[PDB]
Design an enzyme around this catalytic site. Structure first.
Site, PDB file in Angstrom:
ATOM      1  N   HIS A   1       0.842  -1.229   0.000  1.00  0.00           N
ATOM      2  CA  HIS A   1       0.000   0.000   0.000  1.00  0.00           C
ATOM      3  C   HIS A   1       0.855   1.247   0.000  1.00  0.00           C
ATOM      4  CE1 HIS A   1      -0.389  -0.563   4.442  1.00  0.00           C
ATOM      5  NE2 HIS A   1      -0.177   0.739   4.425  1.00  0.00           N
TER       6      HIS A   1
ATOM      7  N   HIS B   1       6.256   7.178   5.999  1.00  0.00           N
ATOM      8  CA  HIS B   1       5.729   6.749   4.749  1.00  0.00           C
ATOM      9  C   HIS B   1       5.141   7.959   4.066  1.00  0.00           C
ATOM     10  CE1 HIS B   1       2.311   6.436   7.407  1.00  0.00           C
ATOM     11  NE2 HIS B   1       1.626   6.831   6.325  1.00  0.00           N
TER      12      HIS B   1
ATOM     13  N   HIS C   1       1.914   9.222   1.090  1.00  0.00           N
ATOM     14  CA  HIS C   1       0.769   8.978   0.243  1.00  0.00           C
ATOM     15  C   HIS C   1       0.900   9.910  -0.961  1.00  0.00           C
ATOM     16  CE1 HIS C   1      -1.518   7.068   3.722  1.00  0.00           C
ATOM     17  NE2 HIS C   1      -0.652   7.806   4.417  1.00  0.00           N
TER      18      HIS C   1
ATOM     19  N   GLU D   1      -3.493  13.631   1.534  1.00  0.00           N
ATOM     20  CA  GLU D   1      -4.693  13.179   2.314  1.00  0.00           C
ATOM     21  C   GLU D   1      -5.397  14.356   2.990  1.00  0.00           C
ATOM     22  OE1 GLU D   1      -3.240   9.654   4.524  1.00  0.00           O
ATOM     23  OE2 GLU D   1      -4.344   8.618   2.928  1.00  0.00           O
TER      24      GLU D   1
ATOM     25  N   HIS E   1       4.075  11.156   6.246  1.00  0.00           N
ATOM     26  CA  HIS E   1       3.637  10.876   7.589  1.00  0.00           C
ATOM     27  C   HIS E   1       4.753  10.267   8.364  1.00  0.00           C
ATOM     28  CE1 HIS E   1      -0.796  10.631   6.153  1.00  0.00           C
ATOM     29  NE2 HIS E   1      -0.321  11.878   6.274  1.00  0.00           N
TER      30      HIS E   1
ATOM     31  N   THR F   1      -4.915   6.725   8.598  1.00  0.00           N
ATOM     32  CA  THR F   1      -5.681   6.866   7.350  1.00  0.00           C
ATOM     33  C   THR F   1      -5.761   5.637   6.504  1.00  0.00           C
ATOM     34  OG1 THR F   1      -3.868   7.627   6.066  1.00  0.00           O
ATOM     35  CG2 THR F   1      -5.026   9.367   7.256  1.00  0.00           C
TER      36      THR F   1
HETATM   37  O1  LIG Z   1      -0.902   5.401   6.903  1.00  0.00           O
HETATM   38  C1  LIG Z   1      -0.615   5.115   8.191  1.00  0.00           C
HETATM   39  C2  LIG Z   1      -0.219   3.807   8.296  1.00  0.00           C
HETATM   40  C3  LIG Z   1       0.157   3.126   9.427  1.00  0.00           C
HETATM   41  C4  LIG Z   1       0.247   3.544  10.762  1.00  0.00           C
HETATM   42  C5  LIG Z   1      -0.046   4.822  11.250  1.00  0.00           C
HETATM   43  C6  LIG Z   1      -0.497   5.998  10.556  1.00  0.00           C
HETATM   44  C7  LIG Z   1      -0.764   6.156   9.162  1.00  0.00           C
HETATM   45  S1  LIG Z   1      -1.294   7.654   8.558  1.00  0.00           S
HETATM   46 ZN   LIG Z   2      -0.226   7.719   6.382  1.00  0.00          ZN
END
Ligand SMILES: Oc1cccccc1=S
Ligand SMILES: [Zn+2]
EC number: 4.2.1.1
Length: 257
Positions: free
Chosen positions: A61, A91, A93, A103, A116, A195
């Site tokens: 993902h 990570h 998005h 997001e 994030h 999210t």
């Molecule tokens: O996208 C996420 C994935 C996994 C753990 C914690 C917060 C976020 S936003």
């Molecule tokens: Zn995230």
């Protein structure tokens, strides 16, 4: 299982994860005129000098840059927080196009991507326990706009060829996450959720006002990753973002006027 496609994307997630329709879901639109300045909010303290990155993983993902969180080495505190939160992973998005991918939105504006930096409250001992607590996580969210390159991102971009497909990992030591931060730590903050499924309502969001700039080539390389496993039909890892969710009974606070 959940994903970002037509049949398993965000509009579907509530069937396996009914909290998707809960009272403190994320992301949200940040209406800058409605956010209230809170002069009691403290400056954010970002202490990353001893951060120890370990590994990078394509989880199907996104990709996660993982850190050694077995000691207080890279911590977030201050700001809206009580206590000490340890960095476990970062990570992003991102979009298929530069006009979408974040997001959170700012007055309905979408950025090309969103970083994030995930932290867990050390009073709960481990990430798994922390996610069951309403103050378990603090997520530092930083917007990406396309323009100049971000030099401190390039070591991430360069390794993505080695983790193209779901389940691949690579050693990723000595990466310094200070190179992904903007100049200002002015922020917005609100209570919300992760999210992605399981969408647990354990996150104090801290969204920086100032984006970082990355080049078109950097975000192009994100878009070459794959949601699929090796030997499965190729599906580019793009548009791995959840849209804005209803604010409900929440107030977004600003650390700045
Ligand atoms: O996208 C996420 C994935 C996994 C753990 C914690 C917060 C976020 S936003
Ligand atoms: Zn995230």
């Amino acid at each position: 299982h959940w994903g970002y496609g037509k049949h398993n994307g965000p509009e579907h997630w509530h069937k396996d994860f009914p909290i998707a329709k809960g009272e403190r879901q994320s992301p949200v639109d940040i209406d800058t005129h409605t956010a209230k300045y809170d002069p009691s909010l403290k400056p954010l303290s970002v202490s990353y000098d001893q951060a120890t990155s370990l590994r990078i993983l394509n989880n199907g993902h996104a990709f996660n840059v993982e850190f050694d969180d077995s000691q207080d080495k890279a911590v977030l505190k201050g700001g809206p927080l009580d206590g000490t939160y340890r960095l476990i992973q970062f990570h992003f998005h991102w979009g298929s196009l530069d006009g979408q991918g974040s997001e959170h939105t700012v007055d309905k504006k979408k950025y090309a991507a969103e970083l994030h930096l995930v932290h867990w409250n050390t009073k709960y001992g481990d990430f798994g326990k922390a996610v069951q607590q309403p103050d378990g996580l603090a997520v530092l969210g930083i917007f990406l706009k396309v323009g100049s390159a971000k030099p401190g991102l390039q070591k991430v971009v360069d390794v993505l060829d080695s983790i193209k497909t779901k389940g691949k990992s690579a050693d990723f030591t000595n990466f310094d996450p200070r190179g992904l931060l903007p100049e200002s730590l002015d922020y917005w903050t609100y209570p919300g959720s992760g999210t992605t499924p399981p969408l647990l309502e354990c996150v104090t969001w801290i969204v920086l006002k100032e984006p970082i700039s990355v080049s078109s080539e950097q975000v192009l390389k994100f878009r070459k990753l794959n949601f699929n496993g090796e030997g499965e039909p190729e599906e580019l890892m793009v548009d791995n973002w959840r849209p804005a969710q209803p604010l409900k009974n929440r107030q977004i606070k600003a650390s700045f006027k």
